[PDB]
């Protein structure tokens with residue numbers, strides 16, 4: 235359940251800068267996506283400090299993409315550190331995804347499957363496998379997916395493959411060129427980074443996104 | 451080649467033990483046999499990125515951060531910069547996300563005077579689903595991008611042979627999957643400049659013995 239269907243992609247690599255901008259929009263968002271830029275620079279503990287400070291949900295955007303054995307250790311360390319869910323790459327195959335799924339089940343946490351990416355290079359290899367990956371996710375029982383806001387038509391095919399009962403979130407809104415509303419037509423929530431945290435006033439920017447989405 | 455950074459004994463230790471003391475102890479025990487250590491997320495996420503500078507100072511070993519960077523260009527650059535800032539000598543990047551994603555890593559590597567290793571084909575079974583079908587092209591893309599260091603699968607020597615003929619004799623190839631995953635040090639080293647070995651060594655009763663034994667079976671070839 236994402237407040238305002240808006241998730242913040244906190245990719246500032248500065249703890250102060252990060253905590254500060256995440257406080258300037260906490261009233262608008264209650265779900266934060268934390269990735270390696272911040273975790274590698276400030277440590278895995280930044281996750282508990284984010285929870286303690288903002289009492290927000292944490293999605294670790296780690297794009298796990300290793301062999302099953304290692305994917306298990308990465309997920310375990312990520313959940314131990316307190317992440318509510320972790321985003322996993324599907325291109326490595328079914329056994330690699332099933333590894334994070336097992337650890338998510340064992341620790342009562344969630345796995346989000348990244349099927350298609352939002353950037354241009356994504357066309358070379360990812361795009362053509364996107365559907366088979368989303369399908370693999372269905373066979374595996376994955377209920378949470380991540381799809382490209384930059385390609386509304388693709389984001390739409392993804393939603394018809396995963397079904398209406400699946401939770402779908404989508405990055406690539408704003409900076410990369412995606413439109414909130416058009417994205418929210420198929421996705422449950424949008425992920426927005428630079429458009430908020432690189433803004434003179436993140437509080438406003440965020441608000442502005444919600445104001446053009448209340449009409450939804 | 452010779453215009454590349456070699457690895458002592460063609461053996462790279464994959465240190466994936468998840469706690470500082472055991473990692474430091476096991477690595478110290480085999481330090482005599484290797485001079486390149488591959489540190490991944492299992493260790494870094496449990497003990498912090500400072501662990502990279504500590505291994506580097508303590509052992510005088512070169513560090514390869516096996517982070518498999520696989521994000522968009524903008525984020526890949528921040529990940530590589532943080533990794534190099536942490537002191538790593540190289541970083542392993544996935545190729546499946548495309549050329550623009552690899553170039554972002556390469557820009558920061560050459561900017562900071564570090565290396566990038568491109569992961570073309572993976573070594574687990576699931577790697578046959580979508581990565582194997584794109585591997586030759588990912589390798590071709592890396593050669594075109596200027597990539598000189600690659601990572602290929604020990605578990606599939608015929609596939610590793612194809613990689614080597616795609617990247618040529620001057621490129622540097624390292625390969626995982628030897629031991630716990632079933633790969634043999636011999637066949638692999640016919641194509642790869644060096645093997646990456648984790649569990650066969652760090653979970654052995656006696657790590658030093660395990661490492662010396664491998665280096666021996668390699669010695670004759």
Ligand SMILES: O=C1CCN([C@@H]2O[C@H](COP(=O)(O)O)[C@@H](O)[C@H]2O)C(=O)N1
Pocket residue numbers: 243245269295348350351352353382405406407408409410425426427428429521522525
């Ligand atoms: O397909 C993907 C992979 C995940 N992401 C992640 O979503 C976030 C987007 O931030 P921006 O809104 O500034 O583009 C960023 O953390 C990025 O790494 C993608 O943008 N696209």
Ligand SMILES: O=C1CCN([C@@H]2O[C@H](COP(=O)(O)O)[C@@H](O)[C@H]2O)C(=O)N1
Pocket residue numbers: 300301304464466490516571572573574603626627628629630631646647648649650
């Ligand atoms: O294709 C790949 C990706 C990198 N790796 C990495 O190589 C290391 C192998 O350790 P083992 O030797 O115990 O299998 C481990 O850290 C693993 O994550 C692969 O094994 N295969």
